[PDB]
Amino acid sequence: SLWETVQKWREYRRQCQRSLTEDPPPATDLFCNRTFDEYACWPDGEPGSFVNVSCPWYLPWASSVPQGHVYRFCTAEGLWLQKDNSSLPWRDLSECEESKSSPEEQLLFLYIIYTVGYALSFSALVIASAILLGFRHLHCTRNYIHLNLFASFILRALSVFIKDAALKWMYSTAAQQHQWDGLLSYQDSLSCRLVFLLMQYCVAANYYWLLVEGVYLYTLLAFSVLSEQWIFRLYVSIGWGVPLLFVVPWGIVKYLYEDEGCWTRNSNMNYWLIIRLPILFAIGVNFLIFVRVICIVVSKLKANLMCKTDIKCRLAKSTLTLIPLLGTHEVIFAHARGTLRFIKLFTELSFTSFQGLMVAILYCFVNNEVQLEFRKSWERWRLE
């Protein structure tokens, strides 16, 4: 991302400035002069010759193009030139821009569908939370867990939107060709740090509230009846509190060993195991429940209940209803090159974007109880 590219630029510039300040000039006559121009290091060349200078490498777009070189000539007088007699070292810095599986179809379409899906899901979950909270007849524990899941999805969408808007505002502040406030933003105090930790916590909270929903459903089907207050307090604690227990250690451990800038680049592969593993476990459990519950449903249809094609028609309708609730698709999908890369980056990413909309529709709009409440309210409002 942008943060990694900037960090690479700082590393390259630190090394190149150290080389500039550590290598004495040959101290000859009629020779080129060393200078620094924040784009490519310019030490002394070879007089009376056209020496090649390598194109800058710190940029991420230079990997696709080969090691290009631009010719620069060092005369026998040490006098430079300028374009239009105003500025700019005439030439020898232009043959590095080529602009070369494309940024248009493979990237812009994906971002558009991501943003529109998250916006639709956020709106749907806001409406769903309003409906669930407004009607007093839908105030069971199941609907409380649904409300918490809706809040988690809304928080994830809000974090994504805030990050996108922050990047857009940074670009806008860079559009006036000045006000380089990014370097201050790299202090890892306010502009960085808090946004990344908040995004990670929101993601973990969503992944662990899918787990709470699955666990509550499993304890409803199997097991027996326990106290409602104890079960709800435990579920809230392990939904909103457990993600802290492995986000805060990541926040304060990345703050010491791998500070860099807001911990965006994970140079250590092992250092990503503190966040990914607790999430993966949260996914893994939700797979097992998804199987077990499905088996239970099958055991209902293959019982002394009337036998027909409904054992397959209804079952396919039940499981597709349970996929958004438990977030099972993460296991089903998670191999990526060209068309395969496009499909992998489309299906997964779009399903992640639209999961909130699917959950809101399936458990707050097509729900029979909420439909009955709406019809009853309409009937009461008809006669005023």
Binding site: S1, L2, W3, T5, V6, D37, E38, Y39, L59, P60, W61, L88, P89, L93, P103, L107, L108, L110, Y111, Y114, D164, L167, K168, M170, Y171, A174, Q177, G182, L349
Partner: peptide, 21 residues
Amino acid sequence: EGTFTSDVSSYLEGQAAKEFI
């Protein structure tokens, strides 16, 4: 995910190069 940040990074490096050199 990476579309916006990649576009912004490319724009940023291009602007910093063209304006200053």
